Enzyme design. Structure first.
Site, PDB file in Angstrom:
ATOM      1  N   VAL A  26      41.453  54.179  45.666  1.00 51.99           N
ATOM      2  CA  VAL A  26      42.111  55.397  45.164  1.00 51.99           C
ATOM      3  C   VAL A  26      41.533  55.945  43.841  1.00 51.99           C
ATOM      4  O   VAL A  26      42.042  56.935  43.303  1.00 51.99           O
ATOM      5  CB  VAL A  26      43.648  55.214  45.045  1.00 51.99           C
ATOM      6  CG1 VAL A  26      44.254  55.057  46.422  1.00 51.99           C
ATOM      7  CG2 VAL A  26      43.999  54.036  44.169  1.00 51.99           C
ATOM      8  N   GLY A  27      40.445  55.345  43.360  1.00 51.14           N
ATOM      9  CA  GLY A  27      39.831  55.755  42.105  1.00 51.14           C
ATOM     10  C   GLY A  27      39.312  54.570  41.304  1.00 51.14           C
ATOM     11  O   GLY A  27      39.950  53.526  41.223  1.00 51.14           O
ATOM     12  N   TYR A  31      36.729  50.323  33.147  1.00 53.03           N
ATOM     13  CA  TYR A  31      38.049  49.726  32.792  1.00 53.03           C
ATOM     14  C   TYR A  31      38.688  48.915  33.986  1.00 53.03           C
ATOM     15  O   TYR A  31      39.479  47.970  33.761  1.00 53.03           O
ATOM     16  CB  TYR A  31      39.055  50.806  32.338  1.00 53.03           C
ATOM     17  CG  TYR A  31      39.438  50.858  30.849  1.00 53.03           C
ATOM     18  CD1 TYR A  31      38.689  51.596  29.908  1.00 53.03           C
ATOM     19  CD2 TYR A  31      40.598  50.229  30.392  1.00 53.03           C
ATOM     20  CE1 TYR A  31      39.075  51.661  28.548  1.00 53.03           C
ATOM     21  CE2 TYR A  31      40.981  50.284  29.049  1.00 53.03           C
ATOM     22  CZ  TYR A  31      40.215  51.004  28.131  1.00 53.03           C
ATOM     23  OH  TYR A  31      40.592  51.072  26.799  1.00 53.03           O
ATOM     24  N   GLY A  32      38.362  49.310  35.232  1.00 55.85           N
ATOM     25  CA  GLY A  32      38.872  48.680  36.463  1.00 55.85           C
ATOM     26  C   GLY A  32      38.862  49.577  37.713  1.00 55.85           C
ATOM     27  O   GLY A  32      38.868  50.812  37.594  1.00 55.85           O
ATOM     28  N   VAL A  34      41.057  50.524  41.385  1.00 55.79           N
ATOM     29  CA  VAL A  34      42.432  50.491  41.908  1.00 55.79           C
ATOM     30  C   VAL A  34      42.461  50.715  43.424  1.00 55.79           C
ATOM     31  O   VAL A  34      41.777  51.594  43.954  1.00 55.79           O
ATOM     32  CB  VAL A  34      43.347  51.560  41.194  1.00 55.79           C
ATOM     33  CG1 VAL A  34      44.794  51.657  41.823  1.00 55.79           C
ATOM     34  CG2 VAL A  34      43.449  51.273  39.695  1.00 55.79           C
ATOM     35  N   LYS A  49      45.248  46.800  40.754  1.00 59.56           N
ATOM     36  CA  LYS A  49      44.116  47.122  39.868  1.00 59.56           C
ATOM     37  C   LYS A  49      43.348  45.857  39.538  1.00 59.56           C
ATOM     38  O   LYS A  49      43.939  44.910  39.019  1.00 59.56           O
ATOM     39  CB  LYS A  49      44.579  47.776  38.552  1.00 59.56           C
ATOM     40  CG  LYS A  49      43.518  47.792  37.452  1.00 59.56           C
ATOM     41  CD  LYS A  49      43.809  48.808  36.322  1.00 59.56           C
ATOM     42  CE  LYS A  49      44.719  48.267  35.241  1.00 59.56           C
ATOM     43  NZ  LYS A  49      44.834  49.261  34.096  1.00 59.56           N
ATOM     44  N   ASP A 161      49.754  54.587  32.106  1.00 58.26           N
ATOM     45  CA  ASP A 161      48.488  54.765  31.380  1.00 58.26           C
ATOM     46  C   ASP A 161      47.353  54.446  32.320  1.00 58.26           C
ATOM     47  O   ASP A 161      46.936  53.280  32.420  1.00 58.26           O
ATOM     48  CB  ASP A 161      48.391  53.920  30.098  1.00 58.26           C
ATOM     49  CG  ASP A 161      47.359  54.486  29.120  1.00 58.26           C
ATOM     50  OD1 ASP A 161      46.306  54.962  29.631  1.00 58.26           O
ATOM     51  OD2 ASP A 161      47.479  54.512  27.860  1.00 58.26           O
TER      52      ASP A 161
END
Ligand SMILES: COc1cc2ncnc(Nc3cc(NC(=O)c4ccnc(N5CCOCC5)c4)ccc3C)c2cc1OCCN1CCCC1
Length: 334
Positions: A26-27, A31-32, A34, A49, A161
């Protein structure tokens, strides 16, 4: 110790318990990554995530421990909460990957737009309710903006966030470090958000830090003598007094045709002096929110211990503290 299965997508190994099925990207970013997934234990739809190289440096490791501590403590209807945290590492020695699980949010505030006065009341009410909770534990969001707000089909909102320029929503005292601050930097942001919902347009769309201040001062006016007295930096003081003196605009001549109680709340939120700005708790009690406010259902958080933030530790010490926090994790009841 549940059964894990492996699998590859987006060019990355995902190793998760069998509990979580049907994964779909989903993106992803720095940073990670998901994934959405089905949770066979609750029939609920969740988001998972995978942190990106969580222990590559001292900055990453401390940040990894900060997110995990924060999500474990937050238990409130308008704040994201932690369903589960897991690692496929059997030991501390082989511990290199962290996975966080939460309720699957659909569409953010950015995506769902002008809109009714009743809708603005309910959406802004839920943000303030969630802000009262995190501010009571000395937690400051600092990056409140429409794309960090989740809103489902029932119009229920959650603060999160995901990590729209940020500067468009930032308090002028933080943007410039010109005066001390408190929790109310987030109250500034909410006013920028509320304005946008009332009128359909970004209130202050600056193209840098200077242009952003210019637009802001055009609306609120140049600082008066009272506020100028508390500006600590000499540089910042010069700049301000060297400007051309702008007057305070009448907010009703700006938010023309809007509900007068919302015009009034906007004025209490978008004040330059941060000693004078309305808090989350005071704002819940304003007459705009009469149809929603209940002082017996607007709770505060348990004390939050954030001393770790002053510590300077090596990577292996932050990594070890994270592992502990994974192991002591107890799921929330259904
Ligand atoms: C559909 O797209 C989604 C849905 C999601 N649902 C649920 N969770 C996530 N992401 C997520 C986020 C986090 N952490 C935080 O939210 C976080 C970190 C730090 N601090 C906070 N606070 C600060 C104070 O207020 C409380 C919040 C919150 C942990 C785990 C997960 C799974 C998503 C993500 C998601 O898509 C992300 C990418 N996508 C591409 C299209 C637009 C965005």
């Amino acid at each position: 110790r549940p059964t894990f299965y492996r699998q590859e997508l987006n060019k990355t190994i995902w190793e998760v318990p069998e509990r979580y099925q049907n994964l779909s990207p989903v993106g992803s970013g720095a940073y990670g990554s998901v994934c959405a997934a089905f949770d066979t234990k609750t029939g609920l739809r969740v988001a998972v995530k995978k942190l990106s190289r969580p222990f590559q440096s001292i900055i990453h490791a401390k940040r990894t421990y900060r997110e995990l501590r924060l999500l474990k403590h937050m238990k409130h209807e308008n704040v994201i909460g932690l369903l589960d945290v897991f690692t496929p590492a059997r030991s501390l020695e082989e511990f290199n990957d962290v996975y966080l699980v939460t309720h699957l949010m659909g569409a953010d505030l950015n995506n769902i737009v002008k809109l009714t006065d009743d809708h603005v009341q309910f959406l802004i009410y839920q943000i303030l309710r969630g802000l009262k909770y995190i501010h009571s534990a000395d937690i400051i969001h600092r990056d409140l903006k429409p794309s960090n707000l989740a809103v489902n089909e029932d119009c229920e909102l959650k603060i999160l966030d995901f990590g729209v320029a940020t500067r468009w929503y930032r308090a002028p005292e933080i943007m410039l470090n010109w005066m001390h601050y408190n929790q109310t930097v987030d109250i500034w942001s909410v006013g920028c958000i509320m304005a946008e919902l009332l009128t359909g347009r970004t209130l202050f769309p600056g193209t840098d830090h200077i242009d952003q201040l210019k637009l802001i001062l055009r609306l609120v006016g140049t600082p008066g003598a009272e506020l100028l007295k508390k500006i600590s930096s000499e540089s910042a003081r010069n700049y301000i007094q060297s400007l051309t003196q702008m007057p305070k605009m009448n907010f009703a001549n700006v938010f023309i045709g809007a509900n007068p109680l919302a015009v009034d709340l906007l004025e209490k939120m978008l004040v330059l002096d941060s000693d004078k700005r309305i808090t989350a708790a005071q704002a819940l009690a304003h007459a705009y929110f009469a149809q929603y406010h209940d002082p017996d259902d607007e709770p505060v958080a348990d004390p939050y211990d954030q001393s770790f933030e002053s510590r300077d530790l090596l990577i292996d010490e932050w990594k070890s503290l994270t592992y502990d926090e994974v192991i002591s994790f107890v799921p929330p009841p259904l």
